[PDB]
């Protein structure tokens with residue numbers, strides 16, 4: 001019992017972190033096999049960030065200009081290429097600590113762990129969701145660029161995020177491991193609009209199921225609703241419309257608790273319309289949307 | 305910017321986790337140098353837990369009855385001893401992955417990371433506080449016993465907690481690494497009272513400073529208070545009385561923000577008396593007490 005915002009164990013990712021320096025800019029890199037991946041803006045000075053021509057900036061660089069240091073050990077760079085917004089530095093040594101891994105592009109609303117790093121050194125690990133507007137509400141300071149987000153399936157690390165930028169609003173933007181930004185963002189020092197965000201409805205319902213499993217049941221009521229009726233309420237409260245695909249992935253939690261998905265929707269409808277009334281659910285005074293149905297099942301069954 | 309409930313990177317601790325089996329009971333063990341530490345209740349059956357005589361139960365066990373497996377590798381047990389509520393199994397092989405470490409007994413109100421484990425395998429990492437009543441509100445299932453709590457100071461892991469028990473209330477109890485329980489608990493299947501808990505005042509003030517640093521400032525007011533006046537409010541709202549020792553450790557945050565500690569106390573006084581008014585602070589709709597002043601400074605400066 002108990003329910004926490006749990007991150008994956010970060011050990012497999014810690015073994016991959018390196019420091020990358022190009023000129024006067026230092027950030028983090030991810031060393032997997034014989035390649036180091038890092039944000040391409042490592043090649044920019046602060047002046048370059050206003051309107052960078054990355055192709056021209058990279059042409060002024062040679063392999064020997066990319067200094068890669070794995071803690072104490074120096075890597076020899078034998079190739080460099082830019083793919084979208086990431087640089088791939090080929091090194092002459094495969095990382096002996098490379099875990100089994102995949103590169104995945106996650107969907108908005110999915111969750112992942114971030115290993116925040118500075119100068120190639122891990123500082124902390126936290127769990128977060130990719131917002132529906134493709135930003136993440138992380139905890140990142142200058143030097144955190146190159147820190148990665150990931151999920152783990154037994155012994156396989158699926159890397160899904162590389163940190164690039166903090167928007168003027170204090171929220172964060174980054175790319176998949178092929179260097180494609182999540183959302184409309186570009187790697188430039190220009191104010192950029194993140195879309196209107198919404199609350200991840202299926203995750204709030206998953207978390208209400210986690211609450212019932214752990215004994216927090218006060219919000220359960222005598223009501224039911226329909227997808228159409230619930231979606232009128234979701235619209236009013238800026239929640240994602242619930243679909244049958246979301247109801248389908250909530251099936252295991254509905255089966256475990258015996259609470260039909262639309263009956264849990266009626267509890268969520270009442271909480272949106274009435275608020276919490278000064279009460280808490282799983283130690284929170286607001287509706288939590290950073291746990292997917294898969295996370296709730298994993299945490300409630302003890303998967304390693 | 306951004307502020308998250310961040311855990312320490314768990315890699316150094318993952319390398320120490322092993323599975324310990326004695327008879328039909330399996331739990332987690334911590335392998336440091338040539339010793340494996342685990343809860344002594346690994347020697348009990350479910351029937352034994354009602355009123356165990358651990359000395360007599362341990363006398364029926366030999367070194368060869370303790371099966372220790374480090375993932376895939378089997379450890380040879382060459383000695384066993386009970387120290388308070390932990391067993392120490394001497395093995396013939398020093399853990400090659402032993403980090404620099406210390407055993408510390410933390411104070412109530414301090415925070416630490418927990419690496420939740422099952423069958424010797426890490427499942428997740430989360431940050432929590434030791435409550436003033438010496439319980440922790442963790443996320444633990446059957447088989448999680450032996451999971452540890454820790455802090456990290458550069459390359460040194462300070463182990464402070466080993467998980468032993470879930471109280472009938474769903475909160476958690478455990479020991480330091482010398483096997484002494486935190487709080488009044490005993491390792492027996494008997495209902496046990498955890499003391500009245502309080503809110504960790506110095507941590508709420510540290511978190512209000514973290515909020516101002518990150519731009520959440522709506523709660524700042526034109527008022528000030530005294531320690532005596534603030535403590536009358538703390539008493540009414542079940543908060544720990546604030547002392548000059550707490551004001552002293554808040555000095556770096558007061559200096560960074562220019563907000564005198566007693567002026568922040570007046571903001572906290574107004575929030576206790578008026579509530580949040582439907583607003584949030586750092587994404588929370590309640591007053592958060594799981595960040596110490598040291599955690600806020602570490603997170604706000606990027607320490608690795």
Ligand SMILES: Cc1c(N)cncc1NC(=O)Cc1cccc(C#N)c1
Pocket residue numbers: 039041049140141142143144145164165166167186187188189190305
């Ligand atoms: C300063 C900072 C913080 N606090 C957190 N995270 C990141 C940063 N760094 C930056 O955003 C620096 C920067 C500037 C312009 C474009 C890009 C890109 N791509 C990157």
Ligand SMILES: Cc1c(N)cncc1NC(=O)Cc1cccc(C#N)c1
Pocket residue numbers: 001343345353444445446447448449468469470471490491492493494
């Ligand atoms: C079942 C469980 C969960 N959910 C989380 N954490 C732990 C458990 N295990 C137990 O509490 C089993 C137990 C029983 C009686 C005394 C002691 C001790 N010491 C340990």
